[PDB]
Amino acid sequence: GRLMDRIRKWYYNAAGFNKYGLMRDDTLYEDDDVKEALKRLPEDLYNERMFRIKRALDLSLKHRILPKEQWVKYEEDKPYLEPYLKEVIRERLEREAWNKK
Template sequence: MASRAPAQTGRVLLGFRKWYYNLCGFNKLGLMRDDTIYENSDVKEALKRLPENVYNDRMFRIKRALDLSLRQQILPKDQWTKYEQDDQYLTPYLDEVIRERKEKEEWMKK
């Protein structure tokens, strides 16, 4: 019985994550989670490091979402971004930028 508890907890947690992902609403506009990150200096540097095609895809999704928002519409349900399709394309670059900034700050303290 104890061995089944972690598996059931994992399924419940995944169900909650999917529910919350759909509740946020950005997927109804075709956005991914990394498209909604607030652009501070670290994020702006990470965006500069993105490959051109990934950056262009991001800009297309954001422009489409702005257009839909202005018209007060959402995409048809078959075009919504699904939880399983949402990859964190910016997160590795952002982690690298933050690590480099912290390393630079440590170096400047010495």
Template structure:
């Protein structure tokens, strides 16, 4: 019986710790999402370039709004903060594709 509770406990613990780390990061207080604050490596830049226009516009709006509030040294009203459960990793499919293509290209270049 204790064995079946352990995975559920660990899953709940992981969720709680993830939520705490997410809130401690502070970017959610500006209305940003996880993928808005990724370090822009060449892979990330290419993934952003491949985003549909609507997602780019939404991302740019969130970033500009965050810069404005940061400059004012204010946070958004709490009801506008990005919630852990609502954060969408919108860039990940594009980023995974870019990384896969880059690795494939590198492996082809090694052959020649």
């Protein structure tokens, strides 16, 4: 029942942030949580995430995109932050419910 995957992959190309050379998690809006996770990122993964964006902006300012061969691919997108994130949300969700007790 590959319905789901077919969709997720579609939408993925639909949103098309790959065209900019972004990763799903790059596009993440920096709310308090995300803000935290990012700080935890290992030097390298963080420094990489950075350039990607600075690159993307430079594109958007230029009104261009990456050549089709450089776009990212649904399965090659590395969800480098999700894990760091989930945990943050887990850590917080804990604290929060404990201050109610």
